[PDB]
């Protein structure tokens, strides 16, 4: 979607593996704020917005 019409996806109840994405050179930018980018798989939250 366009940046002004940014799309939002809701993520409830699904396991995800942020290690295969952090280890990928395809992503030109991977920067995290408030949570360490390395320690990401351990964290648990009730909902995720994308």
């Amino acid at each position: 979607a366009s940046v002004y019409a940014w799309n939002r996806k809701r993520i409830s109840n699904c396991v995800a593996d942020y290690s295969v994405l952090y280890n990928s050179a395809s992503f030109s930018t991977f920067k995290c704020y408030g949570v360490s980018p390395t320690k990401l798989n351990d964290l648990c939250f009730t909902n995720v917005y994308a």
Partner: peptide
Amino acid sequence: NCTFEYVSNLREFVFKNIDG
């Protein structure tokens, strides 16, 4: 707005809601 979706004489059921 959907936040969950699951798919799987006398009958008795007990419905309760405790600690979320």
